[PDB]
């Protein structure tokens, strides 16, 4: 065994204080996140709405999931005047985590796929793979660092870590060849947003195998510090920033269907206070 | 004697997988319960008790897995590498039963919302199919958590063998509506919700097989099964056949549209294929 | 007889899962009742909104006071060796009810006066007899069976209940009355519904009376069960089964607007998949 | 020397009293919320303050109840003399003031916003009466609850003056603007101003009459009277206040659209009356 | 160690009352102002609506962030026949208010920035500078206060006072540059009230950092309670008083916007009773 569980390191007062404070901010974050999201829902045309379901969806995931982690954190260690002395449930705020992921991953796909120009079966195929493969990814990385032999094995923590790694490729190639299959069909300005968006997501995913893998270089209350800390700000800034690109597309996507005469929307469209498209109202229909 | 699985002592592995399932399965409703909502004037007014009745049960089933979660942690104590059961652990499977209760008539209703059955033909298919699910799922209680505390093995194969009467009811008048609508509606529609009712009932049959398990004996790993499966069923289930169900709505609101026989505000799509335009009502000039 | 109190008798394991089942069950179905009413609560004209906000009222209420009911029969009975003792807090199981019924009531009245043709005086005069009758009704049951002499008190229970009885008919004289005068002047199909509503209503009151006086034929788990599971599925039934109705009325009345040309409905209103009125926009005005 | 309400013992029949007038009065906003939020677009745009005053006030009004509830649960303990209270019963009166300091200042915006009272007028009015009341209730909680646990009789008194001062200021300011709106009303309409400006007002003098109660000594049926007396008030003076300013809005934007000023996109009733019909804004081309 | 921490102070009986008092009344303000805020959300053009979002989410923030300062009050202080005894989570009470800041803060600045009239990049990167600027300022503070020797070392206290007024400065530079270039673009009317609101923040703003360095005259039950009751009021003040401004800015904008007939608005606008904007519709299109 090569394996140090980070629930296993005492963690001082300033430690204590530091976790807490990033772990709320980001939860209230996500609620001024999805407050947002659902105000500007209507922003986008009912083509694109499946990438506001699914931010919307994923906002509130990960805005409840943080609320549990919280929880945890809280009833998950005691104060004994040398720090913080873990207690059988503190496991469960790494566990708890994997468990937001698990549903908030996904989401983020469909979310990327929604904005993408895959259409009929190419696209439901697309989903089923990436949703899969994205849950898939997090639960073998669940089951090596929390479930098997309460993360105390090195091998199991190593080989599912590889099996995990194997549906990571699985999930970034269908996205990344949706994204490239679509780029074609889109204007410059949607092209270059889409690309931007998928790199922002893709790119983040890089972060949360190298945070698994640290317990292995030892354990200390600075490392678990470290380990949490990290997650969230990665949480936050991936699942707002990707968000607010998508976002972006949908309004650019939609002014475009409008402006091309394909469609109408009830109210002009902006962004960066620079109007995209004009208010329209359909025409009058007589039975 | 039935071997009542609130009885097994579980793992800290099993412990752990089972409050994962949960959680996630609770998430994953709000995440559809969100979508649900937003995506709740994509159809109809025609069509909308099909809307209401999803969104009535993934709201029940979202705060039923809550109390689940509850009874979860507070039906075991933490005994250095195992979970003991205590007295609230019958409490878990329980709660499951309450959320059926609710859950599982919205789900006939939803169906026979999407269905072409037609003014007394339609109302009466519905009391029939909710009351059969109610009473099916009751009976189940009553035979594996109430009577003689879910202890008795006759009771156990009684009332589950009187629920699966409530079952075939339910299942005949769901089947019969599905087949006598199908003909009526067009090859996209038929195909749709042919897949819908097959996704419901299909799924069913997990229940039953999972109630008898207990009969086999009783473990931590068995209790783990029930517990997961059951979770899987409910998420698979409810998500997998809501989704069909929209689609089905969808259609059937842009085929009125299409037809000229009613008006939408919106374009319609489904998978990024345009169904129907965007429409406005003509304006009138009341008497005034 | 002499009364014995419900919250007095033990319950069985069986018993208490009962108890909880119907009563959680009852809460979620509110649930599921609510979310219904809120999502078709634009399918009925301004006309006749007040029925839309009463029926939804209620419904919310109902919904809470059940939350209070289950929290109050977690922490009124105690598990033993003999089964679930009742504690101090047992009466506040029942009490909560009448709390319940107190808000819940009135608004069923409302709710039926709104669908009613009452106008002017005649409506808002029905309207204050009706709710202080049915307030009145509810607070003589609280007072002679849980406040006076901690409801021990036979002569009380029953006097009580005399008076409650005289404000039960001014209220259903009141509706009855209402219902009888618009009849004549609404259309056959709406007459229909509107009779029907007030049936289901009125009829189902009569139970509530009946299981009050039950604890004069003595006490015992089984009837203390009998007694709560009854009001339950009364609660549900009348609530649920009422409101559908009222609703349905409010439709056809709406949809009859629209065909008279006497209003406008921005969608289609259909019942049991029967099309009543179409789609109208009011006239664009200049100012 | 003042007899601190929270220092009797109260009997089951009492504590059951209280507690059912309590949750039926959180019940009943609830109840009246969700109706203010279903009949918030039978307003025009114009008289909107009048509708989110409201529901703020009774969004208010239904979680401070939730906590004066919770606080009468954990402020009493069940004994063989009854209910005895413990430290946390003075809760349950310091609660309430909680709630007034924001419920009371919504109600006068309220009122104001069905008022005609326009520009700087309108503005400055209403900074003296939101100013005015929550001083009249932060003067209140400071002599019966802060000031030596509400044991100081001198002070009780005192502040209570000091309060009636901030009361005089805001009734003034109020019936000033309503009075001014009046001549600019339609009968109909100002009618409806006047009874709701006098259930507000005439109301008010319910609270400050129950304050001085205290002082005639302290019993387990005073303190009863006391807190279900406050409770009925609350629900009376609220719900019944909030349904008149909102028949007003409506009558008003009825007015509005006749008169050709604005336009509604649903028709507008008042006791099964039509007062407005449907219109839509026209088509503007840019 | 100069520093006399306030969550080391005993408080009376009524110092307790008169802070829950004033943290509620606080909570349920934002309450009234969260309904207020999202009732009159279509009061504004779809081009200044981030505008109502941040104020919303901020609203929203606020809220929920003073329920747990008022959870973490409660569970902070012990009752003894001294008054009040602080324990070992009523450092929690000043942690929480940090976060709230943290938060809320940044907000504020999206706001104020959403109502300017900056276009195309030069608006992108002032909010960029602005949240990062203002979310470091709190940081550094909640660093120098609560987390740093448990906030027991003055040098610290002093020196991330510093660092945080270094990143207040560029914040209110970047802010009062966006409010001075935008004035020249706004009518009058509008410049005024842009003014206006920007005063309001950016002045208020000054009082936290006074109230920071109470601590260092001393400790008192008086002491803690001034500055708790204190940041209350101006965190009351500042987000109610500016926000209100920010929105009647958004309502003229959007009223300009609609005369100048660069837009329309379904609903006509008010402002203190006074017409802006007359109701209008777009027109109707016929899609090829
Ligand atoms: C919003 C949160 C997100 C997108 C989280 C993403 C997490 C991952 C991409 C995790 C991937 C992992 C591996 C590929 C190997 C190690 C185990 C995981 C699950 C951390
Ligand atoms: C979303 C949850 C669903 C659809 C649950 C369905 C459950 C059943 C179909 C249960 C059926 C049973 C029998 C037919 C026999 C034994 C008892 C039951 C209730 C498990
Ligand atoms: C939704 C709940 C409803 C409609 C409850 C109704 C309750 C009654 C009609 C109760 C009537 C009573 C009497 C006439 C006599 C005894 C006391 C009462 C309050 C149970
Ligand atoms: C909905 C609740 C309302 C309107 C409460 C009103 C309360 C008052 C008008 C209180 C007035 C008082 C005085 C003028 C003197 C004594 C202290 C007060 C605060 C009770
Ligand atoms: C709604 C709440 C607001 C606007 C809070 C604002 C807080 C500050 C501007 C704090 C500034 C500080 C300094 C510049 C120095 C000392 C540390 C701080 C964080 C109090
Ligand atoms: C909307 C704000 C909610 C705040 C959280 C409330 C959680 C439950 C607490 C209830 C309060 C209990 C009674 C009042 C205690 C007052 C203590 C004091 O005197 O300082
Ligand atoms: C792998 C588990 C994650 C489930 C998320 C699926 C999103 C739910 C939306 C479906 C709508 C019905
Ligand atoms: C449907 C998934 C069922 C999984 C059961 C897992 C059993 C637990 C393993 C330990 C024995
Ligand atoms: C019905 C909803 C009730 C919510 C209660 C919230 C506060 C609970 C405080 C409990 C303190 C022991
Ligand atoms: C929707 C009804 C839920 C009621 C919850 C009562 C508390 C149960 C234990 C947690
Ligand atoms: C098992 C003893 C209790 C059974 C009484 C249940 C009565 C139900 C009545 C519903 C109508
Ligand atoms: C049991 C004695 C106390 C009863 C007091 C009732 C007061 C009601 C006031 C209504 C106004």
């Known amino acids: 065994t090569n394996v140090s569980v980070p629930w296993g390191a005492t963690l001082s007062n300033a430690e204590h204080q530091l976790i807490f404070y990033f772990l709320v901010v980001a939860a209230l974050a996500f609620v001024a996140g999805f407050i947002r999201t659902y105000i500007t829902r209507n922003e986008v045309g009912s083509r694109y709405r499946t990438a506001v379901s699914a931010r919307l969806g994923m906002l509130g995931v990960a805005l409840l999931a943080y609320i549990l982690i919280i929880v945890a954190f809280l009833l998950g260690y005691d104060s004994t005047a040398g720090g913080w002395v873990p207690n059988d449930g ?60 309460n993360g105390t094995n090195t091998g199991a923590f190593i080989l599912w870590a590889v099996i995990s790694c194997v549906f990571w490729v699985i999930a970034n190639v269908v996205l990344i060849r949706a994204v490239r299959q679509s780029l074609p069909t889109l204007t410059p300005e949607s092209h270059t947003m889409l690309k931007s968006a998928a790199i922002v997501l893709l790119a983040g995913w890089v972060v949360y195998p190298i945070v698994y893998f640290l317990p292995l270089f030892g354990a200390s209350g600075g490392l678990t510090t470290t380990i949490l800390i990290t997650l969230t700000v990665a949480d936050v800034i991936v699942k707002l920033g990707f968000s607010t690109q998508t976002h972006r597309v949908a309004k650019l996507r939609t002014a475009e269907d409008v402006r091309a005469g394909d469609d109408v929307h009830p109210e002009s469209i902006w962004i960066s206070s620079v109007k995209q498209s004009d208010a329209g109202l359909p025409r009058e229909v007589y039975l």
């Open 90 to 149: 503190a496991i469960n705020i790494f566990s708890t985590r994997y468990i937001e992921w698990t549903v908030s991953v996904p989401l983020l796909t469909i979310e990327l796929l929604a904005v993408c120009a895959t259409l009929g079966v190419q696209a439901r195929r697309n989903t089923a793979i990436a949703v899969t493969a994205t849950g898939a990814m997090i639960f073998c990385g669940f089951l090596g660092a929390i479930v098997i032999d």
